[PDB]
From a paper:
Among structural proteins of Sarbecoviruses, spike (S) protein is responsible for receptor binding and mediates membrane fusion between cell and virus to initiate infection. RBDs in [name]-[name]-1 spikes were observed to be in the “up” and “down” positions making the spikes exhibit open and closed conformations, respectively. We introduced these three disulfide bonds in equivalent positions in the [name]-[name]-1 S sequence generating three spike variants: S/x1 (S370C and D967C), S/x2 (G400C and [name]), and S/x3 ([name] and [name]). We determined cryo-EM structures of [name]-[name]-1 S/x1, S/x2, and S/x3 spikes and we identified various previously undetected conformations for [name]-[name]-1 S through classification procedures.
S/x3 was found to exclusively adopt an RBD “down”-locked-1 conformation by cryo-EM. The S/x3 spike was only observed to adopt a symmetrical locked-1 conformation, its protomers share very similar features as S/x1 locked-1 protomers, with bound lipid and residues 602–619 forming a flexible loop. In this study, association of lipid binding and locked conformations were observed for [name]-[name]-1 S/x1 and S/x3 spikes. In locked-1 protomers, interdigitation interactions between Y622, F305, R620, and Y819 are formed through π–π and cation–π interactions. We have proposed that these interactions rigidify this area preventing structural transitions needed for RBD opening. We further demonstrated an engineered RBD “down” S/x3 spike as an immunogen. After priming by 10 μg of S/x3 spike, mouse sera showed induction of neutralization titers against [name]-[name]-1 pseudovirus. A boost by another dose of 10 μg of S/x3 spike increased neutralization titer further by ∼100-fold. The complete immunization regimen induced a serum neutralization titer of ∼5 log10 dilution units.
Author numbering:
A (entry chain A): 209 to 237, 249 to 306
B (entry chain A): 31 to 60
C (entry chain C): 31 to 70, 78 to 138, 150 to 168, 180 to 237, 249 to 603, 619 to 662, 672 to 750
D (entry chain B): 406 to 503
E (entry chain B): 554 to 602
F (entry chain B): 258 to 306
G (entry chain C): 948 to 1045
H (entry chain A): 751 to 1045
The structure:
Amino acid sequence: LPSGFNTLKPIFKLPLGINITNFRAILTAAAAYFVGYLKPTTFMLKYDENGTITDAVDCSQNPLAELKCSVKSFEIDKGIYQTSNFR
Amino acid sequence: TQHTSSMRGVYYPDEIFRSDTLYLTQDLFL
Amino acid sequence: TQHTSSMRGVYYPDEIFRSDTLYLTQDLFLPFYSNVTGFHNPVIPFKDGIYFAATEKSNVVRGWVFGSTMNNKSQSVIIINNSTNVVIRACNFELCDNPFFTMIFDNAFNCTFEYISDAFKHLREFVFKNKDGFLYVYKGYQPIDVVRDLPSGFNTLKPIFKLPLGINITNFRAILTAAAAYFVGYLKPTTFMLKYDENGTITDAVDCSQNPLAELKCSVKSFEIDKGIYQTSNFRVVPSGDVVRFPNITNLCPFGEVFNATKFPSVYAWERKKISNCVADYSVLYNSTFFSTFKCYGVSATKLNDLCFSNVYADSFVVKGDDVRQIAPGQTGVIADYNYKLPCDFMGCVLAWNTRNIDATSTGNYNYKYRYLRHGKLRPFERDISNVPFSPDGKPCTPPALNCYWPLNDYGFYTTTGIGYQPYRVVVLSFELLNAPATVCGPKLSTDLIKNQCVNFNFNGLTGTGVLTPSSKRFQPFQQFGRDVSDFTDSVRDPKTSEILDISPCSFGGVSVITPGTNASSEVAVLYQDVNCWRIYSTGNNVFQTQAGCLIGAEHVDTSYECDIPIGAGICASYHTKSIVAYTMSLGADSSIAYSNNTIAIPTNFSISITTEVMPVSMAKTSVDCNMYICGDSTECANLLLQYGSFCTQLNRALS
Amino acid sequence: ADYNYKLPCDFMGCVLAWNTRNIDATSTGNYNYKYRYLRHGKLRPFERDISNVPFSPDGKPCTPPALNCYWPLNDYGFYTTTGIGYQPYRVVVLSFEL
Amino acid sequence: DVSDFTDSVRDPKTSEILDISPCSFGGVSVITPGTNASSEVAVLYQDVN
Amino acid sequence: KPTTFMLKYDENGTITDAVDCSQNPLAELKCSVKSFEIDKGIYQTSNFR
Amino acid sequence: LSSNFGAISSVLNDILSRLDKCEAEVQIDRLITGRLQSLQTYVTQQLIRAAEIRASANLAATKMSECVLGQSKRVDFCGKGYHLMSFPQAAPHGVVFL
Amino acid sequence: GIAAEQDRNTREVFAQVKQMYKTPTLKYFGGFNFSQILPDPLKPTKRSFIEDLLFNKVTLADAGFMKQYGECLGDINARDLICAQKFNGLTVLPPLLTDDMIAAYTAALVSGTATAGWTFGAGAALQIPFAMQMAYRFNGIGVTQNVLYENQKQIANQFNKAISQIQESLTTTSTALGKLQDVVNQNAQALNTLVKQLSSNFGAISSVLNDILSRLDKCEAEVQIDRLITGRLQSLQTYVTQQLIRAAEIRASANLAATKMSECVLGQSKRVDFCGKGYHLMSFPQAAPHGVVFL
Amino acid sequence: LSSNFGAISSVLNDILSRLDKCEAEVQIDRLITGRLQSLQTYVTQQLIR
Ligand SMILES: CCCCC/C=C\C/C=C\CCCCCCCC(=O)O
Ligand SMILES: *[C@@H]1O[C@H](CO)[C@@H](O)[C@H](O)[C@H]1NC(C)=O
Ligand SMILES: *[C@@H]1O[C@H](CO)[C@@H](O)[C@H](O)[C@H]1NC(C)=O
Ligand SMILES: *[C@@H]1O[C@H](CO)[C@@H](O)[C@H](O)[C@H]1NC(C)=O
Ligand SMILES: *[C@@H]1O[C@H](CO)[C@@H](O)[C@H](O)[C@H]1NC(C)=O
Ligand SMILES: *[C@@H]1O[C@H](CO)[C@@H](O)[C@H](O)[C@H]1NC(C)=O
Ligand SMILES: *[C@@H]1O[C@H](CO)[C@@H](O)[C@H](O)[C@H]1NC(C)=O
Ligand SMILES: *[C@@H]1O[C@H](CO)[C@@H](O)[C@H](O)[C@H]1NC(C)=O
Ligand SMILES: *[C@@H]1O[C@H](CO)[C@@H](O)[C@H](O)[C@H]1NC(C)=O
Ligand SMILES: *[C@@H]1O[C@H](CO)[C@@H](O)[C@H](O)[C@H]1NC(C)=O
Ligand SMILES: *[C@@H]1O[C@H](CO)[C@@H](O)[C@H](O)[C@H]1NC(C)=O
Ligand SMILES: *[C@@H]1O[C@H](CO)[C@@H](O)[C@H](O)[C@H]1NC(C)=O
Ligand SMILES: *[C@@H]1O[C@H](CO)[C@@H](O)[C@H](O)[C@H]1NC(C)=O
Ligand SMILES: *[C@@H]1O[C@H](CO)[C@@H](O)[C@H](O)[C@H]1NC(C)=O
Ligand SMILES: *[C@@H]1O[C@H](CO)[C@@H](O)[C@H](O)[C@H]1NC(C)=O
Ligand SMILES: *[C@@H]1O[C@H](CO)[C@@H](O)[C@H](O)[C@H]1NC(C)=O
Ligand SMILES: *[C@@H]1O[C@H](CO)[C@@H](O)[C@H](O)[C@H]1NC(C)=O
Ligand SMILES: *[C@@H]1O[C@H](CO)[C@@H](O)[C@H](O)[C@H]1NC(C)=O
């Protein structure tokens, strides 16, 4: 899976009401596919002047990202900063 | 078999236009 | 014909005694120096209250008629004096084109209200107001001598009548005898500030919207202003027009297909239908269909005709009478646990009605089922359809065995049972509001667009006041609104022509008032920043541009002095021969000393001087008592305050 | 609440209602009680509308034996044998200030 | 009052006007040595003669 | 009677002392500062009721 | 003290006169928090004013020390010119130096 | 009250002298070059070369006090912060003293020091040649005046070299004026913090008044509006408290600047390390954005 | 930290233990505003000191 950044757009909101716990892909009788799992997480997203998301910060990745999400900025000046306590 | 999702899979959280802002949100993300 | 109401027509706002206070209130008042119309008998319109004045010498004006249609077809009320008593009568009468003195009418038959009083150069003043089915009448009297116009002055009116009529009042007409004049003015919602005496009498008032000096007086709550410059409220404009923009939809929305269907499913197999592209006028249901329960969450019912709805879904099923209470957020029971569950953040409405004459047959209707056995509770808006034998331990079993059951029970619907065992049809509507494109709207009519002007607007149910301009933003197809960093809606897409519009506020720019003392004069000067000399309240005299802003009401002088009113940016103002003058302040006295390389200056004589210097050393020592300030002689309040004691000891420690 | 009787928000008082099927309901059908179901606007609080004029959706006067012209009052049909949702109730509203 | 406190009433049986005043008034100070020395205190009342 | 008390707990969770806040102005001062020991000085207590 | 802070009234007597204890203890708690907030704002303003007065009193004390009890060489610290003497006089909440 | 105190602060710092001395035609006083600290009548500006550098070192935010309504409606794609502040009720008032007036005050003070010396603070100005004034300053620190009169060339050259070194130090980008930038940063950040603090709903249905008025009736909505009213009033109160504390700090700094200007520019001080490192001889004031620079 | 600020309790565990998420998020917001107010008062006193 190549590295990079790409923003996804909504295409479907289906009113199914179905117990979904399992799934399976359908193939034709080369290709590869990759699966990952979502978690409840806090993100900080940046918008352009065209209203497009082009960067994001995952606030639970490392203490630098915690500092970035605390001050709400992508740039940090030189110094020492008291972050949140050890959890 | 095992790979990493390097900044992969961000989507629009709502249907409201925003420009030149930083928006902090909490939702189901990769 | 046209005269002015110079401080005319103030009344008591309530029934509470007040003395030696200034009371600021907001109500329906006659504004100061407003237009009044003189009559020396057409149908005058009644616009949310009137001020009426009668200048008389031979008692010509005798009463009034209030009504809307003024024919035999609607109710009207007559308040008249027939020279012995004052009689008020609200009935249904055929009016005459020329009422005079002694028949004011032909016939009466649907009379509702009746009141008869006891039997019995001039200016008589009245205030009439209509509010919540009550007609309020206020009366005042003044001896005058003028012959043509309404005299200037101040006079306070007292309440005399509060009549429970319940009448549509839009028009009125006076009744005369077969000289006199009468004057009519209109009331507006306005903020006043009233002054009370030591006898509890209103003797002065300030109209807070007359001029910036009155705005300053109402802001500081005083009748006297000291010398100086004061920053008042920013420059505001009032909205002029109305803009309503809704999607153009033609079809009536399918109430008949949903509410009148031959077959509804069971509650365990409830059905969901999407609603789209429709006009939802629920007033066509008032003829045939009636609901026993209808309760909505997330939106008040009285606003349902002023909105437009984004993602409308309708769920349908059938329950018994005792289960209708379970179709609600935060509920428990067999229906809410195993059949149909609602969220907390639900937005929509719930409707249910009794259907014993359709869904109940004799002998017993057994076609409706519900689940009463499950291994866990349902999630919101989740359906379970399977019919598998149930075992408490959790292992598969054959139904003709022990501890193995069928998980569905039958509803037994009979005709002769009580209403708690009778069938009810339930429809749940769910939607979202004001965050997404919408296609199900109310029956409100649209209006043409207005650009570059302060208007009231209504876009898809979102109402506001502002200025609309063409935009350069590029909305994506799933987006309808745009917001600031302060969550203010600043962009919209017009639902008829898909263009983007920017919304801006109407008020902008700081305003300062330069005044001498109130004892000296009532004249002021106004300084507007953010304007080039437009956006000014009035072009009085001497408008010119300074470095601080645009100054109106002051005269520019070329000579420079010390200044007592510092305006700013090197400009100062004073009160000189009288008028207000503005100038550039003087930094000091000009001086010249010449440098030489061989001469010195030496003092030859001296003086002894004594100079004074004043300095503060201490201020007043003060103490507070939390218990008396918060709960004065109340035991219950003291008990409730008892758990805030840490906060109060901190204040006492600081003061000590 | 729209066309017959509307209450304010800042209401102060009490509302009482009780069932009266043994007094105000007769056999065959009691048709002496009426309600308005057609109007050109909503009522204001504590406002009464008494007139009986033929109603037209466009807003112009009309003769009732014609097209798109109706009578604005409907009859309540009160029977003894109906369910309790179609039975008469007497309502008294008390309003005051304190 | 100016602080919206009900200070006057008309008696509904005999139509006389009555003034209502609070019951508590006057500052109180307690002079004490240390609690280890004694339990005796002195009391100073302002606003009393 | 309905009364406010202040109770002291040990390290074993046992009540061994109490202060009746309406007995005398010294007890009012003790209940105001939430302590059993008062330092030397003068303290402004609640107004006369 | 006449703000109701988002309650039914600003008068405790009206709340205790009309409601029971029950709904009223949650209307009384709003007034309690509002009046406590008002007292806190007053105390903060008083602390800032006390700091300003203390700075002024320190300057008055050092000027009294260096100009009444001796002769000062500092330029324009006591009057305009070459300092010879100074005399203090008492004033309401303050001091006047000659 | 805060704004009035800021005007009083500037008046008490800069307006100490009573008569406005004219700039002399000759800028060369017995070996000493005063051209870099005095205004010249050929350039368009009214201030000195060092004051030019000092005004170039500090970046501003508004750069005037006039933002017209049509100008704010012409820049919507560019989300300007000042238009958002002015659209939300926050305004900045001009100072009473123009920068040209403060420059004129400092020019008058430097001319009076270079021509009259120290005597124009005690009373009327007394003229004196610069070498004799230098001799008095040397005599004041315990060195006889023949030391001046025999080494005048060397002292004049060292004075000119030191002025040139200060000029060269001030032409290179540095953080010498770093305590004047903090003031403007704090003011801008406080106003922007109020603007960003305006999106909290304070425990109501929404933070938008239009949504509440669009969905509820007047009835349930007046109790959701009152929560927002108390929250925004609380935010304004917090801003005012922070501003009062910052004003107290600025007033203490301005009092120290005023007494230092009084005791070091209008005379010679004996206090150790109160004006520079060494034995004090002279001082010159220069104007700066929101402040003063002493040489 | 033991004031309930006009809520059911001062313990977050009791609110999360008894109510659902639903009525409880409006009792939690009262505690949030109260504790934020307490921190702000502490910061103001520290600035003056
Ligand atoms: C008889 C002893 C009961 C003891 C109960 C103890 C605590 C109360 C807890 C649960 C009882 C709730 C009963 C409601 C039954 C479901 C009602 C329904 O059908 O929706
Ligand atoms: C159906 O959903 C419920 C809800 O969480 C879950 O407990 C259950 O396991 C699901 N059914 C199956 C077969 O997994
Ligand atoms: C916004 O879109 C336009 C489309 O022409 C493009 O030219 C511009 O570069 C975009 N903006 C940015 C910041 O990429
Ligand atoms: C009041 O009357 C004057 C004179 O006829 C007119 O100029 C003015 O527009 C009127 N104002 C209003 C509000 O009718
Ligand atoms: C109402 O008035 C009209 C004419 O004004 C008349 O023809 C009609 O009979 C009247 N109806 C009643 C009920 O008085
Ligand atoms: C005025 O009207 C009342 C109402 O009944 C009547 O009793 C009285 O006689 C009338 N007076 C005259 C002079 O007609
Ligand atoms: C109003 O008058 C008409 C005709 O006179 C009558 O039929 C009707 O019943 C009256 N209204 C009432 C409420 O009595
Ligand atoms: C009756 O009152 C309503 C309520 O505003 C109004 O719309 C209507 O026009 C009134 N009737 C007449 C005949 O004016
Ligand atoms: C109050 O009323 C009395 C009545 O005798 C009158 O004398 C007095 O002048 C009045 N007070 C004022 C301020 O007019
Ligand atoms: C609704 O259903 C009923 C059956 O009880 C029927 O009589 C009626 O005509 C239906 N409505 C319409 C508009 O067809
Ligand atoms: C209301 O229903 C009745 C009963 O059939 C009918 O006669 C009348 O025309 C209906 N009214 C409208 C406006 O459709
Ligand atoms: C109706 O809506 C469509 C949607 O784009 C629009 O194109 C059309 O102009 C609208 N009709 C009118 C008469 O404006
Ligand atoms: C606007 O004001 C400026 C001064 O700030 C002035 O130079 C300019 O001429 C003014 N505009 C017009 C059109 O006069
Ligand atoms: C100047 O000094 C002389 C004595 O030397 C004295 O008589 C005179 O009064 C002084 N001048 C003034 C104006 O006092
Ligand atoms: C009853 O009330 C009247 C009202 O003024 C009063 O005059 C009378 O004294 C009262 N009766 C008694 C026994 O007090
Ligand atoms: C009340 O106190 C004053 C001192 O403030 C004193 O002069 C006076 O005598 C006292 N009153 C009596 C009745 O002793
Ligand atoms: C607590 O209980 C233990 C029991 O052994 C006892 O020894 C100890 O003294 C008690 N603590 C106090 C403070 O009395
Ligand atoms: C004095 O300074 C000016 C400006 O830098 C310079 O032009 C001039 O040459 C200097 N004089 C001497 C003697 O260096």
